[PDB]
Amino acid sequence: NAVRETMDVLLEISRILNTGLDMETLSICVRLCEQGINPEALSSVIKELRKATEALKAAENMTS
Amino acid sequence: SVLHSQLQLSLTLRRLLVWTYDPKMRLKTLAALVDHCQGRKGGELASAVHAYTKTGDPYARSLVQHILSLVSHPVLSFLYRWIYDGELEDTYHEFFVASDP
Amino acid sequence: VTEAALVRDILYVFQGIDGKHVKMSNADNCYTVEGKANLSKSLRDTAVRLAELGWLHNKIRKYTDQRSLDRSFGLVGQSFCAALHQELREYYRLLSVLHSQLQLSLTLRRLLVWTYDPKMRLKTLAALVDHCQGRKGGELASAVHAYTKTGDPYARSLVQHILSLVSHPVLSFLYRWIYDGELEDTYHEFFVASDP
Amino acid sequence: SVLDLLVQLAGSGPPRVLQNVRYGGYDCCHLSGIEADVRSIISGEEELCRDLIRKTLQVMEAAPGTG
Amino acid sequence: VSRILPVAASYSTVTRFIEEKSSFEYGQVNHALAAAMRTLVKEYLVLVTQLEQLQRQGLLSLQKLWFYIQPAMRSLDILASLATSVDKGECIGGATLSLLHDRSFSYTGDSQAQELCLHLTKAASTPYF
């Protein structure tokens, strides 16, 4: 419950930051950070993957 | 209001019916349950809600489920009241778990 | 009669100066739209609704002038008139903000909308004055303290600040009595009066 | 590190554009204008939504209809 | 127009209610009660003023009025009925608070009124509490 509450507070902060980050992404990021993943690497990969997902979504919308 | 804007200066009687097709369904969905919830109150009104709790047409179903979860608050709240206070002050004895004065 | 012309006339009346198509009727002690200002009866009604600020403000200007016209009002009556003057500065600032947006505009709707609070504040101040007219010294302090019991927290807080300020003269006299036993009362203002 | 990553993602959600008493002199036309602007923004949003739905329908009005 | 008129009396009487109960013989707490209603009647005026903005844009459609009048006529009506009863019963002291809590539970079911009366009762409690 402590991890869940911490994740909820972090998600609230991120929503205040207007990041549009998911709770599942938050949990995955918590696991990566405890695993020793660079916050900069995680955020850069997140931005690149968000851009790729947006491009794929646009392409599939034109691909319907 | 959108219709009155379209009346300003367009559409067609055909385009109007085309822009009024799905509203007919979204309205009939509730029109059907209106006569099916006549006089239903307490558990009667609850069962009238379950008379649409399983209907198809996921648009109508979405409307029904949304409205039902909205109305569930009066009853879910009565439940939480009987949880915390162990109280249902139904002046009309409307509580499903009623008391005897 | 142009609506903006009447608007300018009202912008003058809000400062208590009757407008061009409206005349401050002594039969009403308030701005009365000249019937020659032929417009919508709705327009004249709106002018009449706005003119209440003019009537109350004219009454206030007269009263605060009467209170400053006599030096027998004492420091207390002077403080009453000066607080009225500070509130008048606030009201004039409100009218100045009104001329501010009067440039470039708004409408009678926005005017009356922003004057609804001004009307309420004027009504509160006028009720305080009409409930404190002809009171002196302790009679004036009690007149204020009698209106110091009503609700309406905006007017109530304005009156509370006014009373905290007005006690300053009374408080100073009391502190003189406490520390010096000093009653310099020209007209025996102090509750502990003296027998010379 | 999660905080830094979220900070890097901060702003990647859509920016948010629309979401004891007075001393007598504390009455302000700032609040009045704020409320007026909010009401005007509400009306503008309603009109914009109406116009956008109208544009979507008008663009569809000249199309074939089978896709 | 007759269908939209309903808030007409709700405002005429609302202005009367905000006037009459302001008297100290109507109570200083009931004067606060009328001042509280003043906040919303002011919002009803402000919404009528912003409606003026759309009329000054020459872009008024009767449906858009009713499409907007519908949301606010209920907001006027609930407080109009609560004030009508507050003076029809001449409620004052803790009896008026009793009536307020009653009307709160009676307007339970309309959150558009329940939350407003939640603020109304909150404001009224100040003098009472």
Coordinates of C-alpha atoms in Angstrom, one line a residue:
Chain A
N1 CA 0.0 0.0 0.0
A2 CA 3.0 2.3 0.7
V3 CA 4.2 1.7 -2.9
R4 CA 0.7 2.3 -4.3
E5 CA 0.3 5.6 -2.3
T6 CA 3.8 6.7 -3.4
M7 CA 2.9 5.9 -7.0
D8 CA -0.4 7.8 -6.6
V9 CA 1.4 10.9 -5.2
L10 CA 4.0 10.7 -8.0
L11 CA 1.2 10.4 -10.6
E12 CA -0.5 13.4 -9.1
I13 CA 2.7 15.4 -9.3
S14 CA 3.3 14.3 -12.9
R15 CA -0.3 15.2 -13.9
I16 CA 0.4 18.6 -12.3
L17 CA 3.5 18.6 -14.4
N18 CA 1.2 17.9 -17.4
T19 CA 3.1 14.8 -18.5
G20 CA 0.3 12.5 -19.4
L21 CA 2.1 9.5 -17.8
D22 CA 0.3 6.3 -17.0
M23 CA 0.2 4.5 -13.7
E24 CA 1.5 1.3 -15.3
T25 CA 4.3 3.4 -16.8
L26 CA 4.9 4.7 -13.3
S27 CA 5.2 1.2 -11.8
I28 CA 7.4 0.1 -14.7
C29 CA 9.6 3.1 -14.1
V30 CA 9.8 2.4 -10.4
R31 CA 11.0 -1.1 -11.2
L32 CA 13.6 0.2 -13.7
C33 CA 14.9 2.8 -11.2
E34 CA 15.2 0.2 -8.5
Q35 CA 17.0 -1.9 -11.1
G36 CA 19.5 0.9 -11.8
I37 CA 18.2 2.6 -14.9
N38 CA 19.2 6.2 -15.6
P39 CA 16.3 8.7 -15.1
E40 CA 17.7 10.5 -18.2
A41 CA 17.8 7.3 -20.2
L42 CA 14.3 6.3 -19.1
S43 CA 12.8 9.8 -19.9
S44 CA 14.6 10.0 -23.3
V45 CA 13.4 6.5 -24.3
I46 CA 9.9 7.5 -23.0
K47 CA 9.8 10.6 -25.2
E48 CA 11.2 8.7 -28.3
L49 CA 8.7 5.9 -27.7
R50 CA 5.8 8.3 -27.2
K51 CA 6.7 10.0 -30.5
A52 CA 7.0 6.6 -32.2
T53 CA 3.6 5.5 -30.8
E54 CA 2.0 8.8 -31.9
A55 CA 3.4 8.4 -35.4
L56 CA 2.2 4.8 -35.5
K57 CA -1.3 5.9 -34.3
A58 CA -1.5 8.5 -37.0
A59 CA -0.3 6.0 -39.6
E60 CA -2.9 3.4 -38.5
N61 CA -5.6 6.1 -38.5
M62 CA -4.7 6.8 -42.1
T63 CA -4.5 3.0 -42.5
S64 CA -8.0 2.2 -41.5
Chain B
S1 CA -28.9 24.3 -30.4
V2 CA -26.7 22.7 -33.1
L3 CA -29.9 22.2 -35.1
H4 CA -30.9 25.9 -34.7
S5 CA -27.4 26.8 -35.9
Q6 CA -27.9 24.5 -38.9
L7 CA -31.3 26.3 -39.4
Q8 CA -29.4 29.5 -39.5
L9 CA -28.7 30.2 -43.2
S10 CA -28.4 24.8 -44.0
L11 CA -28.4 21.0 -44.4
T12 CA -31.5 19.6 -46.2
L13 CA -34.6 18.0 -44.8
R14 CA -32.6 14.9 -45.8
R15 CA -29.4 16.1 -44.2
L16 CA -31.4 17.0 -41.1
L17 CA -32.8 13.5 -40.8
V18 CA -29.3 12.2 -41.4
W19 CA -28.0 14.5 -38.6
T20 CA -30.9 13.3 -36.5
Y21 CA -30.7 9.6 -36.9
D22 CA -28.5 8.5 -34.0
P23 CA -30.3 11.0 -31.6
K24 CA -33.4 9.0 -32.3
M25 CA -31.8 5.8 -31.0
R26 CA -30.1 7.6 -28.0
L27 CA -33.5 8.9 -27.1
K28 CA -35.6 5.8 -27.7
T29 CA -33.1 3.9 -25.4
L30 CA -34.5 5.9 -22.5
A31 CA -38.0 6.2 -23.9
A32 CA -38.3 2.4 -23.7
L33 CA -37.3 2.3 -20.0
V34 CA -39.4 5.3 -19.1
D35 CA -42.7 3.3 -19.5
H36 CA -40.8 0.3 -18.0
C37 CA -40.0 2.2 -14.7
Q38 CA -43.5 3.7 -14.2
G39 CA -44.2 4.0 -10.5
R40 CA -41.2 1.9 -9.6
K41 CA -39.7 3.0 -6.2
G42 CA -37.1 1.6 -3.9
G43 CA -36.6 -2.0 -4.9
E44 CA -39.2 -1.4 -7.6
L45 CA -37.2 1.4 -9.2
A46 CA -34.1 -0.7 -8.7
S47 CA -35.6 -3.6 -10.5
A48 CA -36.8 -1.3 -13.2
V49 CA -33.1 -0.3 -13.6
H50 CA -32.2 -4.0 -13.8
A51 CA -34.9 -4.1 -16.5
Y52 CA -32.2 -2.3 -18.6
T53 CA -29.1 -3.6 -16.8
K54 CA -28.6 -6.2 -19.5
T55 CA -29.9 -4.5 -22.7
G56 CA -27.9 -4.5 -25.9
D57 CA -26.9 -1.7 -28.2
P58 CA -23.7 -0.7 -26.4
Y59 CA -24.6 3.0 -27.0
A60 CA -27.9 2.6 -25.1
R61 CA -26.1 0.2 -22.7
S62 CA -23.4 2.9 -22.0
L63 CA -26.2 5.4 -21.3
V64 CA -28.0 2.9 -19.1
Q65 CA -24.9 1.8 -17.2
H66 CA -23.7 5.4 -16.7
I67 CA -27.1 6.6 -15.5
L68 CA -27.4 3.5 -13.3
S69 CA -24.0 4.0 -11.6
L70 CA -25.1 7.6 -11.1
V71 CA -28.4 6.5 -9.5
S72 CA -26.6 3.8 -7.5
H73 CA -25.2 6.6 -5.4
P74 CA -28.5 7.1 -3.6
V75 CA -28.6 3.4 -2.8
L76 CA -24.8 2.8 -2.4
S77 CA -24.9 5.8 0.0
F78 CA -27.8 4.2 1.9
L79 CA -25.5 1.1 2.1
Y80 CA -22.6 3.1 3.4
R81 CA -25.0 4.8 5.9
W82 CA -26.0 1.4 7.2
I83 CA -22.3 0.6 7.3
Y84 CA -21.2 3.6 9.3
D85 CA -24.3 4.8 11.2
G86 CA -26.2 1.5 10.8
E87 CA -28.9 3.9 9.8
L88 CA -31.6 4.3 7.1
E89 CA -33.8 7.2 8.1
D90 CA -36.3 6.5 5.4
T91 CA -39.3 8.8 6.1
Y92 CA -41.2 6.8 3.4
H93 CA -39.7 3.5 4.6
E94 CA -37.8 3.6 1.3
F95 CA -34.8 1.8 2.8
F96 CA -34.4 -1.8 1.5
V97 CA -33.3 -2.7 5.0
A98 CA -36.1 -0.8 6.8
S99 CA -36.8 -0.4 10.5
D100 CA -40.0 -0.5 12.6
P101 CA -41.2 2.5 14.5
Chain C
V1 CA -31.0 59.8 -27.3
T2 CA -27.8 57.8 -27.8
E3 CA -27.2 55.0 -25.4
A4 CA -23.6 55.9 -25.2
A5 CA -24.6 59.6 -24.6
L6 CA -26.7 58.4 -21.7
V7 CA -23.8 56.3 -20.6
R8 CA -21.6 59.4 -20.4
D9 CA -24.4 61.2 -18.5
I10 CA -24.5 58.3 -16.1
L11 CA -20.7 58.1 -15.8
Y12 CA -21.0 61.7 -14.6
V13 CA -24.0 60.9 -12.3
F14 CA -22.1 58.0 -10.7
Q15 CA -19.8 60.8 -9.5
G16 CA -22.9 62.6 -8.3
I17 CA -23.0 65.0 -11.3
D18 CA -26.4 64.6 -13.1
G19 CA -26.2 63.7 -16.7
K20 CA -27.2 65.4 -20.0
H21 CA -30.4 63.5 -20.7
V22 CA -31.1 62.9 -17.0
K23 CA -31.8 65.5 -14.4
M24 CA -31.4 65.0 -10.7
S25 CA -34.9 65.7 -9.6
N26 CA -35.4 67.5 -6.3
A27 CA -38.8 65.7 -6.4
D28 CA -36.7 62.5 -6.1
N29 CA -33.3 63.6 -4.8
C30 CA -32.0 61.4 -7.5
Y31 CA -31.3 61.3 -11.3
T32 CA -34.5 61.3 -13.3
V33 CA -34.1 60.7 -17.0
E34 CA -35.5 63.7 -18.8
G35 CA -38.6 62.6 -20.7
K36 CA -37.1 64.3 -23.7
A37 CA -34.5 61.5 -23.6
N38 CA -36.9 59.5 -25.7
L39 CA -35.6 55.9 -25.7
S40 CA -36.8 52.4 -24.9
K41 CA -38.8 52.4 -21.7
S42 CA -36.4 49.5 -20.9
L43 CA -33.5 52.0 -21.4
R44 CA -35.1 54.6 -19.1
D45 CA -35.8 51.8 -16.5
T46 CA -32.1 50.8 -16.7
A47 CA -31.2 54.5 -16.1
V48 CA -33.5 54.7 -13.2
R49 CA -32.0 51.5 -11.8
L50 CA -28.5 52.9 -12.1
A51 CA -29.5 56.2 -10.7
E52 CA -29.9 54.8 -7.2
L53 CA -26.1 55.0 -6.8
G54 CA -26.5 58.7 -7.8
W55 CA -29.2 59.4 -5.2
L56 CA -27.3 57.6 -2.4
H57 CA -24.0 59.3 -3.5
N58 CA -25.7 62.7 -3.6
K59 CA -27.1 62.1 -0.1
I60 CA -23.7 60.9 1.1
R61 CA -21.9 63.9 -0.5
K62 CA -24.4 66.3 1.2
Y63 CA -24.1 64.5 4.6
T64 CA -20.3 64.3 4.6
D65 CA -20.2 68.0 3.6
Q66 CA -22.6 68.8 6.4
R67 CA -20.5 66.9 8.9
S68 CA -17.3 68.6 7.7
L69 CA -19.1 72.0 7.5
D70 CA -19.3 72.1 11.3
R71 CA -16.3 72.0 13.6
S72 CA -18.6 71.0 16.5
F73 CA -18.5 67.5 15.0
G74 CA -15.3 67.0 17.0
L75 CA -12.5 64.7 16.2
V76 CA -15.1 61.8 16.1
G77 CA -17.4 63.4 13.6
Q78 CA -14.3 64.5 11.6
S79 CA -13.2 60.9 11.6
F80 CA -16.6 59.8 10.4
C81 CA -16.5 62.3 7.6
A82 CA -12.8 61.3 6.8
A83 CA -13.7 57.6 6.7
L84 CA -16.5 58.6 4.4
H85 CA -13.9 60.5 2.4
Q86 CA -11.7 57.4 2.2
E87 CA -14.7 55.3 1.1
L88 CA -15.4 58.1 -1.4
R89 CA -11.9 57.8 -2.7
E90 CA -12.6 54.0 -3.1
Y91 CA -15.9 54.8 -4.8
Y92 CA -14.2 57.4 -7.0
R93 CA -11.5 54.7 -7.8
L94 CA -14.4 52.4 -8.8
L95 CA -15.9 55.1 -11.0
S96 CA -12.4 55.7 -12.5
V97 CA -12.1 52.0 -13.2
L98 CA -15.5 52.4 -14.8
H99 CA -14.2 55.2 -17.0
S100 CA -11.3 52.9 -17.7
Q101 CA -13.4 50.4 -19.3
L102 CA -15.7 53.2 -20.5
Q103 CA -13.0 53.8 -23.0
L104 CA -12.7 51.5 -26.0
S105 CA -16.9 50.1 -23.6
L106 CA -18.9 47.3 -22.1
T107 CA -22.7 47.6 -21.8
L108 CA -25.3 48.7 -19.4
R109 CA -25.4 45.0 -18.3
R110 CA -21.7 45.1 -17.3
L111 CA -22.1 48.5 -15.7
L112 CA -25.0 47.4 -13.5
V113 CA -23.2 44.1 -12.8
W114 CA -20.2 45.9 -11.4
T115 CA -22.4 48.4 -9.7
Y116 CA -24.5 45.8 -7.9
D117 CA -21.7 45.5 -5.4
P118 CA -21.3 49.3 -5.4
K119 CA -25.0 49.6 -4.8
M120 CA -24.7 47.2 -1.8
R121 CA -21.7 49.0 -0.4
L122 CA -23.4 52.4 -0.8
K123 CA -26.5 51.0 0.9
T124 CA -24.4 49.7 3.8
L125 CA -22.7 53.0 4.3
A126 CA -26.0 54.9 3.9
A127 CA -27.6 52.7 6.5
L128 CA -24.7 53.4 8.8
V129 CA -25.0 57.2 8.2
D130 CA -28.8 57.2 8.6
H131 CA -28.4 55.2 11.8
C132 CA -25.7 57.6 13.1
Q133 CA -27.1 61.0 12.1
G134 CA -27.5 63.4 15.0
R135 CA -25.4 61.3 17.4
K136 CA -22.4 62.7 19.2
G137 CA -19.5 61.4 21.2
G138 CA -20.7 58.4 23.0
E139 CA -24.1 58.7 21.2
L140 CA -22.2 58.5 17.9
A141 CA -20.0 55.6 19.2
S142 CA -23.2 53.8 20.3
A143 CA -24.8 54.5 17.0
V144 CA -21.9 52.8 15.3
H145 CA -21.9 49.9 17.7
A146 CA -25.6 49.4 17.1
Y147 CA -25.0 48.8 13.5
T148 CA -22.0 46.7 14.5
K149 CA -24.3 43.8 15.1
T150 CA -25.9 43.1 11.7
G151 CA -24.8 40.4 9.3
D152 CA -23.6 40.8 5.7
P153 CA -19.9 40.1 6.4
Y154 CA -18.7 42.5 3.7
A155 CA -20.5 45.6 5.1
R156 CA -19.9 44.2 8.6
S157 CA -16.2 44.0 8.0
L158 CA -16.2 47.5 6.5
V159 CA -18.0 48.7 9.7
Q160 CA -15.6 46.7 11.9
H161 CA -12.6 48.4 10.4
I162 CA -14.4 51.8 10.7
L163 CA -15.1 51.1 14.3
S164 CA -11.6 50.0 15.1
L165 CA -10.4 53.2 13.5
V166 CA -13.1 55.3 15.3
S167 CA -12.1 53.9 18.6
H168 CA -8.7 55.4 18.0
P169 CA -9.9 58.8 19.2
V170 CA -12.0 57.3 21.9
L171 CA -9.1 54.9 22.7
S172 CA -6.7 57.8 22.9
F173 CA -8.9 59.7 25.3
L174 CA -9.3 56.6 27.4
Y175 CA -5.5 56.0 27.4
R176 CA -5.1 59.7 28.5
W177 CA -7.5 59.1 31.3
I178 CA -5.6 55.9 32.3
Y179 CA -2.0 57.2 32.1
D180 CA -2.3 60.9 32.6
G181 CA -5.9 61.2 33.8
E182 CA -6.1 63.7 31.0
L183 CA -9.5 65.0 29.8
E184 CA -8.9 67.9 27.4
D185 CA -12.6 67.7 26.3
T186 CA -13.6 70.9 24.6
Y187 CA -17.3 70.0 24.9
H188 CA -17.0 67.4 27.7
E189 CA -16.6 64.6 25.2
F190 CA -15.1 62.2 27.7
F191 CA -17.4 59.8 29.7
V192 CA -15.5 60.9 32.7
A193 CA -16.4 64.5 32.3
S194 CA -15.1 67.2 34.7
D195 CA -16.6 69.9 36.8
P196 CA -14.6 73.1 36.4
Chain D
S1 CA 15.3 9.3 -11.1
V2 CA 11.6 8.6 -11.6
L3 CA 11.0 12.2 -10.6
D4 CA 13.5 13.4 -13.2
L5 CA 12.0 11.2 -15.9
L6 CA 8.5 12.6 -15.0
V7 CA 9.9 16.1 -15.1
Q8 CA 11.3 15.4 -18.6
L9 CA 7.8 14.2 -19.5
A10 CA 6.3 17.2 -17.7
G11 CA 4.3 19.3 -20.1
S12 CA 3.9 16.4 -22.5
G13 CA 0.4 16.1 -21.3
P14 CA -1.8 18.8 -23.0
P15 CA -1.2 22.3 -21.5
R16 CA -4.0 23.4 -19.3
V17 CA -5.5 26.6 -20.7
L18 CA -9.0 26.4 -19.2
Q19 CA -9.8 24.6 -15.9
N20 CA -12.3 37.4 7.9
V21 CA -13.9 39.7 5.3
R22 CA -13.2 42.8 3.1
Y23 CA -11.7 46.0 4.5
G24 CA -14.3 47.9 2.4
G25 CA -11.6 49.0 0.0
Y26 CA -10.7 45.4 -0.7
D27 CA -13.6 45.1 -3.2
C28 CA -11.9 44.7 -6.5
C29 CA -12.9 44.8 -10.1
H30 CA -10.1 42.2 -10.6
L31 CA -12.4 39.4 -9.3
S32 CA -15.4 40.8 -11.3
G33 CA -13.3 40.9 -14.5
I34 CA -12.0 37.4 -13.7
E35 CA -15.6 36.1 -13.4
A36 CA -16.6 37.9 -16.6
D37 CA -13.6 36.4 -18.5
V38 CA -14.5 33.0 -17.2
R39 CA -18.1 33.4 -18.4
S40 CA -16.9 34.8 -21.7
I41 CA -14.6 31.8 -22.1
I42 CA -17.4 29.4 -21.3
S43 CA -19.5 31.1 -24.0
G44 CA -16.6 31.1 -26.5
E45 CA -16.0 27.4 -25.8
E46 CA -19.6 26.6 -26.4
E47 CA -19.7 28.5 -29.6
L48 CA -16.4 27.0 -30.7
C49 CA -17.7 23.5 -30.1
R50 CA -20.8 24.3 -32.0
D51 CA -18.8 25.7 -34.9
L52 CA -16.4 22.7 -34.9
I53 CA -19.2 20.2 -35.0
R54 CA -20.8 22.3 -37.8
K55 CA -17.5 22.3 -39.7
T56 CA -17.2 18.5 -39.3
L57 CA -20.7 18.0 -40.7
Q58 CA -20.2 20.5 -43.5
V59 CA -17.1 18.8 -44.6
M60 CA -19.0 15.5 -44.6
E61 CA -22.0 17.1 -46.4
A62 CA -20.3 17.0 -49.9
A63 CA -18.6 13.6 -49.6
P64 CA -19.7 10.4 -51.2
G65 CA -20.7 8.7 -47.9
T66 CA -19.4 5.1 -48.4
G67 CA -16.1 5.9 -46.7
Chain E
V1 CA -40.7 32.6 -23.9
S2 CA -43.3 31.3 -21.3
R3 CA -41.1 28.2 -20.8
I4 CA -38.1 30.4 -20.3
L5 CA -40.0 32.9 -18.2
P6 CA -40.0 30.6 -15.2
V7 CA -36.8 32.1 -13.8
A8 CA -38.5 35.5 -14.2
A9 CA -40.5 35.2 -11.0
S10 CA -37.6 33.3 -9.5
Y11 CA -35.5 36.4 -9.8
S12 CA -38.2 39.0 -9.0
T13 CA -39.0 37.1 -5.8
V14 CA -35.3 36.4 -5.3
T15 CA -34.6 40.1 -5.3
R16 CA -37.5 40.6 -2.9
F17 CA -36.2 37.8 -0.7
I18 CA -32.7 39.3 -0.7
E19 CA -34.2 42.6 0.3
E20 CA -36.8 41.7 2.9
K21 CA -34.7 39.3 5.0
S22 CA -31.8 41.7 5.2
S23 CA -33.5 43.5 8.0
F24 CA -32.1 43.2 11.5
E25 CA -35.6 42.4 12.6
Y26 CA -35.5 39.7 9.9
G27 CA -32.2 38.7 11.7
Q28 CA -28.6 39.5 11.2
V29 CA -28.0 35.9 10.4
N30 CA -30.9 35.9 8.0
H31 CA -29.3 39.1 6.6
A32 CA -26.2 36.9 6.0
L33 CA -28.5 34.4 4.5
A34 CA -29.7 36.9 2.0
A35 CA -26.2 38.1 1.4
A36 CA -25.2 34.5 0.6
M37 CA -28.0 34.4 -2.0
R38 CA -26.6 37.6 -3.3
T39 CA -23.5 35.8 -4.4
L40 CA -25.4 33.5 -6.7
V41 CA -27.9 36.1 -7.8
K42 CA -24.9 38.1 -8.8
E43 CA -23.6 35.1 -10.8
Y44 CA -27.1 34.9 -12.4
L45 CA -26.7 38.5 -13.3
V46 CA -23.1 37.9 -14.6
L47 CA -24.4 35.1 -16.8
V48 CA -27.0 37.4 -18.1
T49 CA -24.2 39.9 -18.7
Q50 CA -22.1 37.4 -20.5
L51 CA -25.3 36.6 -22.5
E52 CA -25.1 40.3 -23.4
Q53 CA -21.7 39.6 -24.9
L54 CA -23.3 37.1 -27.3
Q55 CA -26.1 39.5 -28.1
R56 CA -23.6 42.3 -28.7
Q57 CA -22.0 39.8 -31.1
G58 CA -25.3 39.7 -33.0
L59 CA -25.1 35.9 -32.7
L60 CA -28.0 34.9 -30.5
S61 CA -30.2 31.9 -31.3
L62 CA -33.2 31.0 -29.3
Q63 CA -32.1 27.4 -28.9
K64 CA -28.7 28.5 -27.6
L65 CA -30.6 30.6 -25.0
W66 CA -32.8 27.8 -23.9
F67 CA -29.8 25.4 -24.3
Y68 CA -28.2 27.7 -21.7
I69 CA -31.2 28.8 -19.8
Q70 CA -32.0 25.2 -19.0
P71 CA -28.8 24.7 -16.9
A72 CA -29.4 27.9 -14.9
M73 CA -33.2 28.0 -14.4
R74 CA -32.7 25.0 -12.1
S75 CA -30.0 26.8 -10.2
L76 CA -32.3 29.8 -9.7
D77 CA -35.4 27.6 -8.9
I78 CA -33.8 25.6 -6.1
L79 CA -32.8 28.7 -4.2
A80 CA -36.1 30.4 -5.0
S81 CA -38.0 27.5 -3.4
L82 CA -35.7 27.4 -0.4
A83 CA -36.1 31.1 0.1
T84 CA -39.8 31.0 -0.5
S85 CA -40.1 28.4 2.2
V86 CA -37.6 30.2 4.4
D87 CA -40.0 33.2 4.5
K88 CA -43.3 31.2 4.2
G89 CA -42.3 29.5 7.4
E90 CA -40.9 32.8 8.8
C91 CA -38.0 30.6 9.9
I92 CA -35.6 32.1 12.4
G93 CA -33.1 30.9 14.9
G94 CA -32.3 27.3 15.1
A95 CA -35.7 26.5 13.6
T96 CA -34.5 28.1 10.4
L97 CA -31.3 26.0 10.6
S98 CA -33.6 23.0 11.0
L99 CA -35.5 24.0 7.9
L100 CA -32.2 24.5 6.1
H101 CA -30.9 21.1 7.0
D102 CA -34.3 19.7 6.0
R103 CA -34.3 21.4 2.6
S104 CA -30.7 20.1 2.3
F105 CA -31.8 16.5 2.7
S106 CA -34.8 17.4 0.5
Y107 CA -32.6 18.7 -2.3
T108 CA -30.5 15.6 -1.8
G109 CA -30.7 13.9 -5.2
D110 CA -29.8 16.9 -7.2
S111 CA -26.0 17.6 -6.7
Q112 CA -26.5 20.8 -8.8
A113 CA -28.5 21.8 -5.7
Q114 CA -27.0 19.5 -3.0
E115 CA -23.5 21.0 -3.3
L116 CA -24.9 24.6 -3.5
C117 CA -26.9 24.0 -0.3
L118 CA -23.8 22.4 1.2
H119 CA -22.2 25.8 0.7
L120 CA -25.3 27.6 1.8
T121 CA -25.5 25.7 5.1
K122 CA -21.8 26.1 5.5
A123 CA -22.1 29.9 5.2
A124 CA -25.1 30.0 7.5
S125 CA -23.4 27.9 10.2
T126 CA -20.9 30.6 10.7
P127 CA -23.2 32.9 12.7
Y128 CA -25.0 29.9 14.3
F129 CA -21.8 28.0 15.2

